[PDB]
């Protein structure tokens, strides 16, 4: 994978199918892609597969299990502090790989499959070069932040917005993903 | 259904590309001229015709989706050809860029009108003409999105 970074989205389930599957915990659907649009009866957000693990934000997945074709799957990692949870990446998904170039120029992939430039202004923050209303970003928690070669730099967590417009975003650097695995 | 950002177009004389940016289907004036674009309801005329910039634009056709302009100022461009081939191009200036790996002109033929993307897939410019030395294209000429933005 590399550049230019292009992304597309595909809906696979609807409101009722999601609820039944949520309860049954058995999803026999075909899974493809590196980023999965995820949902609970509460909210919808994203989960990103990095190195065989499907990572998402704790404030969305809480400590719930992921519905798989073999019943619910318990989390592999939970880290309330890092705001991370991770389940084994579903069979069929493709994983991203952590960044290894230290690029300061990141690209956040929204739930609508829009790639938006973000200039890193710290270990867990970056600013939108072209701000957007906070609604553009709703549902995007857990989504990936990539460097020019399409490697994971971090997972979108919260947006630093003011007056209703997101000007910057706070993310979970891929390093926390490592510290969360070792412990 | 699936919508395309880049349309492959033709005139009796030639074939080239058009790119949809900001709701307008842009292409090179040296390809379209002042011709209208075909539609199921009859020919639709150019919204913009900037003969100077070698630029023309009609209202975006059907089965198309618009591309977003670049706002990251990257110099790492990527040219999409008429065969959907992607060619890495390093920007040399306002409207010029060097192919990272030169290709024989045939490979770039018929792609004018196509887009020059930044590492985020956003429109940096519109492919105007290939700058080749002895049949080998090693650079490209392009219309910056800002120009399209200005013409609107």
């Amino acid at each position: 994978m590399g550049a230019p970074i292009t992304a597309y989205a595909q809906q696979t389930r609807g409101l009722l199918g999601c609820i039944i599957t949520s309860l049954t915990g058995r999803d026999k659907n075909q899974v493809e892609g590196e980023v999965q649009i995820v949902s609970t009866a509460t909210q919808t957000f994203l989960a990103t597969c990095i190195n065989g693990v499907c990572w998402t934000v704790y404030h969305g997945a809480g400590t719930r299990t992921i519905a798989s074709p073999k019943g619910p799957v318990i989390q592999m990692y939970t880290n309330v502090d890092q705001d991370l949870v991770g389940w084994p990446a579903p069979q069929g998904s493709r994983s991203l790989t952590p960044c290894t170039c230290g690029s300061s120029d990141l690209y956040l992939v929204t739930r609508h499959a829009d790639v938006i430039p973000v200039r890193r202004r710290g270990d867990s923050r970056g600013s939108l070069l072209s701000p957007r209303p906070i609604s553009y970003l709703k549902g995007s928690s857990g989504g990936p932040l990539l460097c020019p070669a399409g490697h994971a730099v971090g997972l979108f967590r919260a947006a630093v917005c003011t007056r209703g417009v997101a000007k910057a975003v706070d993310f979970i650097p891929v390093e926390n993903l490592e510290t969360t695995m070792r412990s | 259904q699936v919508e395309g950002e880049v349309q492959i177009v033709s005139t009796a004389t030639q074939t080239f590309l058009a790119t949809c940016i900001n709701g307008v289907c842009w292409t090179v004036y040296h390809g379209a001229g002042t011709r209208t674009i075909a539609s199921p309801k009859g020919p639709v005329i150019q919204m913009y015709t900037n003969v100077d910039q070698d630029l023309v634009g009609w209202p975006a056709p059907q089965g198309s989706r618009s591309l977003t302009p670049c706002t990251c100022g990257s110099s790492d461009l990527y040219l999409v050809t008429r065969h959907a081939d992607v060619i890495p191009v390093r920007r040399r200036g306002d409207s010029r860029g060097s192919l990272l790996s030169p290709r024989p002109i045939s490979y770039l033929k018929g792609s004018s009108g196509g887009p020059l993307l930044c590492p985020a897939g956003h429109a940096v410019g519109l492919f105007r003409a290939a700058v080749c030395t002895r049949g080998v294209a090693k650079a490209v000429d392009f219309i910056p999105v800002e120009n399209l933005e200005t013409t609107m």
Binding site: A7, V35 | D85
Partner: peptide, 22 residues
């Protein structure tokens, strides 16, 4: 609580393609 369910996806692996005729 109930399980988190995959409701869709976003694919980065894709690359420019001439949309095939139907």
């Amino acid at each position: 609580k109930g399980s988190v369910v995959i409701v869709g996806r976003i694919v980065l692996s894709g690359k420019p393609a001439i949309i095939p005729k139907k």
